[PDB]
Amino acid sequence: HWGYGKHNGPEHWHKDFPIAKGERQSPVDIDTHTAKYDPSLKPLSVSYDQATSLRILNNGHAFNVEFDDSQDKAVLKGGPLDGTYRLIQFHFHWGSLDGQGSEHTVDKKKYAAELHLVHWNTKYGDFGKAVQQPDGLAVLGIFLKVGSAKPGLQKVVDVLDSIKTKGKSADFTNFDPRGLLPESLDYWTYPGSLTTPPLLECVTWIVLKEPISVSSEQVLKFRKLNFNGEGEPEELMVDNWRPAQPLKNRQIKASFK
Ligand SMILES: NCCCCOc1ccc(S(N)(=O)=O)cc1
């Protein structure tokens, strides 16, 4: 199975997922001087007041916090988007060291981690159908830097002991993802892909300019998770990020000057 190790990592993925070498792969480096301000970009509309979180799962590559997406409860609209995108899950990518972990980079700078809030276009009915469309998903990407603690992240950190290994899940109701956002909703946007297999080219990426800060203890607890299942040799879940891919025939637009 694909992974992040030397023998099954990002360099290998193209052999089973040839779209790895495609025209709109993610993540990418965001060159801030080359991105263009687009005054026609609308403000993001993040409407999470009615979010219903259900469960947290170690899926062997990261942990997902899952939401009830059977109604318009937590949705993303506006910005570059046409229509309404429902929150289905969020997850993170992170490093073994504070100087790496993010998937997107900014002027080649790597953050300690990156949060992905994953949404699907309600005109396609369900997530499985959405990922087969060029405008199927909207992923909101938020950089994490190490500094002061993020209070709204702590309930996530404290449950990770109960989902240490692959396939473990825990009830995770009443979590408010609004606590994970920075102050500003200024963003960059570009057309891209899932950053894990199957690497489908179905994502409108919206990457916030302002990182959130998390504490060293918070990200240390991420690093104590396991890629492996219970009773298997322990492999710490670290460096579960794909490096920047060629931008090719794309331009990154900015919502701000
Ligand atoms: N030397 C043996 C290594 C074992 C792993 O083999 C793999 C070979 C390829 C993949 S892929 N194309 O899904 O990333 C995953 C695992």
Ligand SMILES: NCCCCOc1ccc(S(N)(=O)=O)cc1
């Ligand atoms: N067709 C099944 C798809 C399963 C994977 O779902 C993903 C959903 C989001 C991402 S990412 N890192 O681009 O936000 C990766 C994978």
Ligand SMILES: [Zn+2]
């Ligand atoms: Zn992701």
